[PDB]
Design a binder for this molecule. Structure first.
Ligand SMILES: Nc1nc2c(ncn2[C@@H]2O[C@H](COP(=O)(O)OP(=O)(O)OP(=O)(O)O)[C@@H](O)[C@H]2O)c(=O)[nH]1
Ligand SMILES: Nc1nc2c(ncn2[C@@H]2O[C@H](COP(=O)(O)OP(=O)(O)O)[C@@H](O)[C@H]2O)c(=O)[nH]1
Ligand SMILES: [Mg+2]
Lengths: 186, 95, 244, 430, 439
């Protein structure tokens, strides 16, 4: 999946404006609900997931288990409406030595510890439309001192609305981004 | 076949060999307090009298219960099981 | 009505051999003869979502004999109401209970004369609404007791217009939360799992599950400090909104 | 430590307890005069929860017999074991509530309840670490329904962290005793639910059915009904006064039976209870105790358990029995009625064990279960009350004592609402 | 110059802790009063009482334990029984109000009034010993007091003493049979605290032992008194090498060095054999080769988890009795041959063998009958992913409508705490699978 494929400037793993918003992704919902709607903040269609039992509901990157989503894109970013409830998103990465690293981010946790397999960290999401640029390069070097070759998996849980997900490959300001990536203000 | 002890009155936890030993070796399971005959002819001598009745009416109507219940011996479970040496040695077997 | 010719009803695959009186389950006491399954009770379902049979509403009694001053104009494309007198002078404490009693009415024109009348009072009305809050609960409570999708939907549109209409009106609903909330418990998570396929209920918000959430949220912001504490006692699933 | 006090009201309350203490007195071995005559060391290890000491060596029941008429409390004294109550504890008026919830809740009870609360304060303060109160009252009696319900309200304002157990007898539809039952009963629940930490419903109709189908005793008497209710009284606190394999206090039972904050109504039962003549034949062996526990007839309430599904249940097994078969029977009774049990609370049976049997038995079980059936009592009570209100029948006494006609409708919304919301969880699934 | 301090918290710990002392008390010739008889001394070697006891100068001895429980009934029983003379009077610290199964109750609100005293008592016993190897902590997860107190005490200990080793012998809820109705709630929270603060913790689910009792002892009427005793023997097995002679011993510090591949995966389940009643204990040879067969029989596992569904990481399986080393060689080889026991790819050999000579003792009045050879196994297997699997699923059902939640939010704990435990348990689920994938 996405191996031996070109990755220079941008990569659109997921999106919302299209005939089939999600084909690579796989869904598994037990108590939640999945749908898309138009948001009153930005005049466009946005995919939304809501529910309770935050851990039970999620949407995975790879179609099924037993394969890989290897990508050499140095940065990870994502646009998400702040719903002011529980929220999470975790990614898994591969280091220079043959080890598996997964970092899980929680909004409702205030204490962080590193671990041989998990490294938690808190967040803060502001009201209104906002974007987060998870470094994914220094963080891996600040926890295990082992360089990062590729990112294996990207996972998003419920209680959030996402317009676009993309990998930077270098720090970009507002001016650089083509029209599509930029989130035009209402 | 019919360990007289187990089913009728519940026995606390113990070994099957030990629990069975306690029942068939204890008293009762015999002796006639009334002397009725096996043939069924001493019937007209005995009266078949149950001494657990007084009377009732105009206040309270339950009457106490028959002698099939314990008393005096009331003591928690911890007491019986846990003790140091006041029990038969597991491997005594005098020879 | 029509009925099939029952007697002619036929069967094809089943054979036409007859066992007759001769049978007997004796002499063959095997270990696998069929055993009749004893009659068993069904699983009780009861009345989760059955109809409620709204009772008689006071609206018609007033309009029938001509006591609520209201007319159904027709100059505009869609019927727009015209007030006989300028609605400033009206004694809101008197008629306002009459209107929300109309929420129940569905048959025309009352149902149309029911909702539209309510909106007008709360728009221009600014300060005289507050004294009428204590008396507004009774008509609304049973309306939420209807358990009808058409009936329940409008009030939720009604409630939102009710609170933010005037200042400080929001908090006064807090001590009355113990009565309005109950119905909201049932429909909280009755949404459609359409998935990737788009949902077009956008133009008409008839999706009951989504409609509720926006209703509860607006309360706590306007409820004040005590907005959150009381809410948790009625519908547990709620999550703090004002708090980070 | 973790002691309790008893405050009982109404003629139904005063008489019911009188057999409650008498039953309790024998178990510990305390004779009517107050001089110890027990037989075991354990008998006195925990005489402090219910009994208090004084120079002279006899013991006192921490109760305050409270009622609005002089006949009941003057009568209870003359009864057997009637000398235990402390003369200072008695509090009573001089008018009589006249079965009027207004009299015992606004006009008459208020004037006298000022003092009765003072005795509540004194008794509560002395204890080492107060645990909670157990209130006895019948919702069908004006002074009992009003004064009893108004007593609790202020109590909840002074001890927010203590448990409050209330035993009420609701008027069943089959047999009624007062023409004004629906009015007073309807009002009470409006306040009892919001204040009581736990309330157990008891139906008179069930008892008379129980006395015949099981007891078969030809001539039941007001003693007979009191005996059965008193027996279940010892079940909730059976293991609290003795040692055992698993302790179980009132708080633990509350912490495991009330799913949501708005549901604190239970129903109870007792076993074994076999006819007097045929007592020598039966075998008291674990399964026989449990099957008698879940049968509809044994249920203390007229509401049929199998007309609804059990949200949860707790059984306080008491006596000498191996824990394993105590637990195994509970599991067997959870699948065989899988549908009858709500399926979003897995493993919904609770067990407890105590090792001190009362006088007259080798094993017994006390049953406290929360079932969806109770919606039948509220609806049936709700239906009758709604009938009398449309015609202003008997309303003119309550309106003449400071109340307004509006106050009742507010009760109507609450009673029905709890009726509907109780059944909301009866149909939800995964 | 070696010692261990025993901590019992909660009724489950206390009652089992009570059991563990009669076995320990007899095993060194100390009667209930604590005084060693001047006649009929059976003592092999000296200092043997030192591993768990401390001398009083002349005569009796004392146990190295601290009992904690807020319910006076359970504790008050011991002080009035036949072992009153044994324990030190002012170490049975207890309160007045019960925890009431509210996990927050014993950890945020009621516990804070006793935790301070408990640590201070721990300070006194720390100085008395010389080189303390570690602590043994017993507690039942299914209770708030055990779960609530256990977390608070462990976290304080992890900061007060530091790198010293601690062991927890818990008792987790069964798959279908469970006494309480709120046990699933406090199970998830407990493992969250105990995963980050303990070295070795074993599984002792009740339901499995019931099957353990029935198959061998042939007793259909078991009670907790018999149940706890069996745990006593395993307690003796794990410490056979710290107070006796041997040919190849094992220290307690040699457990965080052979049985935990990674810091996170440190849950292990045990198994005991043989347990043959006196009525049948003397009709077979009980060879070392055959006994170890019973050790790996799927049914006799200490917990209700079938090992056949996973991998075997490492089994530090111990011996006591008349075992010659040469026989042990034949026993280890035979196990590897069998195709029903399959190991991981990165652990060629996964056995740490131990031997001790002092044979198991017989507690009078019990069920066990005397034997020559006994092997107790502490085995880490990938099958443990199941026990956490069902526990997490149960949590999901009850918290969808968040029933029973409002009895906790009133105890001062924040709402988000409940969800956080899911991250710890759920994340643990993904780790086991990653350990077992063949590379
Ligand atoms: N192995 C074993 N487990 C027990 C015993 N007694 C209780 N348990 C377990 O303990 C759990 C319930 O907790 P309790 O033992 O009653 O006591 P607790 O957990 O400390 O909580 P509290 O009683 O409030 O102090 C049950 O699920 C049982 O599994 C016992 O004698 N032996
Ligand atoms: N258990 C029991 N209940 C009784 C007895 N006598 C009356 N009752 C109940 O008491 C209720 C009437 O109470 P009431 O006298 O009006 O209470 P009061 O108004 O406070 O005096 C009836 O519903 C009866 O069911 C009795 O001897 N035993
Ligand atoms: Mg306890």
């Amino acid at each position: 999946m996405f191996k031996n494929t070109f990755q220079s400037g941008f990569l659109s793993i997921l999106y919302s404006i299209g005939s089939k918003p999600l084909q690579i992704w796989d869904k598994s919902i037990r108590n939640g609900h999945i749908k898309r709607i138009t948001d009153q903040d930005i005049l466009s269609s946005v995919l939304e997931i809501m529910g309770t039992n935050v851990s039970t509901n999620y949407i995975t990157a790879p179609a099924d288990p037993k394969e890989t989503l290897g990508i050499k894109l140095p940065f990870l970013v994502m646009i998400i409406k702040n719903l002011k409830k529980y929220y999470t998103f975790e990614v898994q990465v591969l280091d220079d030595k043959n080890v598996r690293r997964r970092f899980r981010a929680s909004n409702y946790q205030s204490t962080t510890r590193v671990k041989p397999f998990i490294c938690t960290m808190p967040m803060r999401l502001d009201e209104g439309w906002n974007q987060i640029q998870f470094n994914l390069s220094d963080f891996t070097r600040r926890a295990y001192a082992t360089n990062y070759i590729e990112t294996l998996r990207v996972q998003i849980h419920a209680n959030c609305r996402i317009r676009r997900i993309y990998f930077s490959d270098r720090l970009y300001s507002e001016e650089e981004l083509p029209p599509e990536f930029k989130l035009f203000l209402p | 076949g019919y360990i007289p002890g187990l089913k009728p009155n519940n026995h606390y936890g113990a070994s099957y060999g030990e629990i069975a030993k306690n029942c068939l070796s204890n008293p009762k399971v015999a002796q006639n307090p009334f002397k009725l005959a096996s043939t069924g002819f001493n019937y007209q001598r005995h009266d078949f009298r149950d001494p657990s009745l007084t009377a009732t009416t105009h206040k309270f109507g339950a009457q106490t219960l028959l002698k099939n219940h314990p008393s005096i011996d009331q003591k928690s479970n911890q007491w019986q099981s846990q003790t140091h040496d006041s029990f038969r040695n597991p491997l005594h077997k005098p020879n | 009505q029509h009925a099939p010719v029952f007697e002619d009803s036929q069967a094809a695959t089943v054979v036409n051999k007859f066992q007759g009186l001769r049978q007997g389950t004796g002499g063959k006491t095997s270990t696998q003869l069929p055993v009749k399954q004893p009659f068993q009770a069904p699983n009780p379902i009861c009345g989760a979502f059955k109809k409620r049979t709204i009772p008689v509403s006071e609206f018609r009694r007033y309009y029938d004999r001509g006591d609520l001053p209201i007319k159904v104009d027709h100059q505009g494309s869609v019927n727009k109401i015209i007030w006989v007198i300028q609605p400033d002078q009206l004694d809101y404490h008197h008629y306002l209970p009459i209107f929300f009693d109309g929420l129940r009415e569905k048959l025309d024109p009352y149902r149309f004369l029911a909702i539209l009348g309510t909106y007008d009072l709360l728009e221009k009305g600014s300060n005289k609404i507050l004294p009428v809050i204590p008396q507004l609960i009774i008509p609304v409570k049973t309306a939420l007791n209807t358990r009808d999708n058409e009936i329940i939907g409008i009030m939720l549109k009604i409630l939102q217009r009710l609170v933010v209409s005037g200042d400080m009106i929001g908090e006064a609903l807090v001590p009355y939360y113990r009565q309005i909330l109950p119905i909201f418990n049932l429909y909280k998570n009755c949404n459609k799992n359409v998935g990737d396929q788009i949902d077009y209920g956008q133009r008409k918000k008839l999706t009951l599950g989504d409609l509720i959430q926006e209703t509860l949220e607006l309360f706590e912001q306007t409820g004040g400090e005590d907005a959150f504490i009381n809410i948790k006692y009625m519908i547990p699933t709620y999550e703090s909104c004002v708090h980070n | 430590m973790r002691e309790i006090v008893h405050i009982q009201g109404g003629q139904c309350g005063n008489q019911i307890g009188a057999k409650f203490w008498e039953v309790i007195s024998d178990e510990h071995g305390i004779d009517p005069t107050g001089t110890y005559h027990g037989d075991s060391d354990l008998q006195l290890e925990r005489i402090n929860v219910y009994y208090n000491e004084a120079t002279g060596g006899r013991y006192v029941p921490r109760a305050i017999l409270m009622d609005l008429e002089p006949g009941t409390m003057d009568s209870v004294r003359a009864g057997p074991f009637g000398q235990l109550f402390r003369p200072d504890n008695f509090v009573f008026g001089q008018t009589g509530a006249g079965n009027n919830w207004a009299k015992g809740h606004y006009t008459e009870g208020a004037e006298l309840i000022d003092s009765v609360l003072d005795v509540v304060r004194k008794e509560a303060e002395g204890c080492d670490c107060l645990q909670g109160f157990q209130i006895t009252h019948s919702l069908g009696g004006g002074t009992g329904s009003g004064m009893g319900t108004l007593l609790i309200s202020k109590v909840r304002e002074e001890y927010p962290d203590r448990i409050m157990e209330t035993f009420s007898v609701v008027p069943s539809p089959k047999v009624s005793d007062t023409v004004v039952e629906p009015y007073n009963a309807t009002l009470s629940v409006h306040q009892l639910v919001e204040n009581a930490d736990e309330c157990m419903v008891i139906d008179n109709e069930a008892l008379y059915d129980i006395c015949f189908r099981t007891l078969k005793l030809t001539t039941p008497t007001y003693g007979d009904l009191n005996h059965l209710v008193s027996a279940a009284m010892s079940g909730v606190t059976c293991c609290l006064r003795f040692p055992g394999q698993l302790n179980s206090d009132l708080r633990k039972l509350a912490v495991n039976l009330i799913p949501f904050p708005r549901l604190h109504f239970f129903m109870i039962g007792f076993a074994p209870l076999t006819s007097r003549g045929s007592q020598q034949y039966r075998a008291l062996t674990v399964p026989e105790l449990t099957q008698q526990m879940f049968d509809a007839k044994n249920m203390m309430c007229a509401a049929d358990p199998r007309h609804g599904r059990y949200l949860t249940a707790s059984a306080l097994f008491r006596g000498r029995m191996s824990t394993k078969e105590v637990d195994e029977q509970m599991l067997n009774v959870q699948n065989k009625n899988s549908s009858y049990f709500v399926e979003w609370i897995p493993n919904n049976i609770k067990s407890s064990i105590c090792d001190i049997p009362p006088k007259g038995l080798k094993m017994a079980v006390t049953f406290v279960g929360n079932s969806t059936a109770i919606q039948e009592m509220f609806k049936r009570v709700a239906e009758q009350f709604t009938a009398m209100f449309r015609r202003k029948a008997f309303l003119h006494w309550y309106t003449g004592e400071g109340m307004d006609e509006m106050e009742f409708t507010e009760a109507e919304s609450n009673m029905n609402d709890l009726v509907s919301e109780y059944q909301q969880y009866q149909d939800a699934t995964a | 110059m070696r010692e261990v301090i025993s901590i019992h918290v909660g009724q489950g710990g206390i009652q089992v802790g009570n059991a563990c002392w009669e076995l320990f008390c007899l095993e060194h010739g100390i009667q209930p009063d604590g005084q060693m008889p001047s006649d009929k001394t059976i003592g092999g070697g000296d200092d043997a009482f030192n591993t768990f006891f401390s001398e009083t100068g002349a005569g009796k001895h004392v146990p190295r334990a601290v009992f904690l429980d807020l319910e006076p009934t359970v504790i008050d029983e011991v002080r009035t029984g036949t072992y009153r003379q044994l324990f030190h009077p002012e170490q049975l610290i207890s309160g007045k109000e019960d925890a009431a199964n509210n996990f927050a109750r014993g950890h945020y609100t009621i516990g804070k009034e006793i935790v301070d005293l408990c640590l201070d008592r721990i300070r006194k016993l720390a100085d008395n010993c010389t080189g303390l190897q570690g602590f043994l902590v017993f507690n039942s997860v299914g209770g708030g007091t055990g779960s609530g107190l256990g977390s608070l005490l462990l976290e304080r200990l992890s900061v007060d003493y530091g790198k010293k080793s601690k062991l927890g012998f818990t008792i987790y809820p069964s798959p279908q049979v469970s006494t309480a109705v709120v046990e699933p709630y406090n199970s998830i929270l407990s493992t969250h605290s105990l995963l980050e603060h303990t070295d070795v913790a074993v599984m002792l689910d009740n339901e499995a032992i019931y099957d353990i009792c029935r198959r061998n002892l042939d007793i259909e009427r078991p009670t907790y008194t018999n149940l706890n005793r069996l745990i006593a023997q395993v307690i003796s097995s794990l410490t056979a090498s710290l107070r006796f002679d041997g040919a190849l011993n094992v220290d307690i510090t040699e457990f965080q060095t052979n049985l935990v591949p990674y810091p996170r995966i440190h849950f292990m389940l045990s198994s005991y054999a043989p347990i043959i009643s006196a009525e049948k204990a003397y009709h077979e040879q009980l060879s070392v080769a055959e006994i170890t067969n019973s050790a790996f029989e799927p049914a006799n596992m200490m917990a209700k988890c079938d090992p056949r569904h996973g991998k075997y990481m490492a089994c530090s399986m111990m011996y006591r009795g008349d075992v010659v080393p040469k026989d042990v060689n034949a026993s280890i080889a035979t196990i590897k041959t069998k195709r029903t026991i399959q190991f991981v790819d990165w652990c060629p050999t996964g056995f740490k063998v131990g031997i001790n000579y002092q044979p198991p003792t017989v507690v009078p009045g019990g069920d066990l009958a005397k034997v020559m050879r006994a092997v107790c196994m502490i085995s880490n297997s990938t099958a443990i992913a199941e026990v956490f699997s069902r526990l997490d699923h149960k949590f999901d059902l009850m918290y969808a409508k968040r029933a029973f939640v409002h009895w906790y939010v009133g105890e001062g704990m924040e709402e988000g705490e409940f969800s956080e435990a899911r991250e710890d348990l759920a994340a643990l689920e993904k780790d086991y699978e990653e350990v077992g994938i063949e590379t």
